[PDB]
Amino acid sequence: SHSAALEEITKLVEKSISVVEKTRKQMNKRFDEVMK
Amino acid sequence: SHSAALEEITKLVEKSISVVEKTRKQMNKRFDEVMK
Asked: Other remarks (chains A, B)?
């Protein structure tokens, strides 16, 4: 039960990391756009 | 205590993800404000 929950939480943390990565990529592209 | 904490970590992670989505949506709208 612990292993299933911790692994499930681990997937959620990986999803959060991935959405943070695409978020920073998008806002960096937007920063390039606003500087342009 | 663990299962209460296990869902506590899960709910905190999912609410953090929701806050991240709200933040990115609002800042994209506000960058659109910036360009206009």
From this structure: Is the main neurotoxin responsible for the human envenomation syndrome known as latrodectism that results from bites by Latrodectus species.
Q: Is A2 exposed, middle or buried (0-12, 13-18, 19+ CB in 10 A)?
A: exposed
Of B10, B28, B34, the CB nearest to A12: B10
- Residues A7 and B7: beta-carbon distance below 8 Å: no
3-state secondary structure string, chain B? CHHHHHHHHHHHHHHHHHHHHHHHHHHHHHHHHHHC
Quote the tokens at residue B8: 């506590």
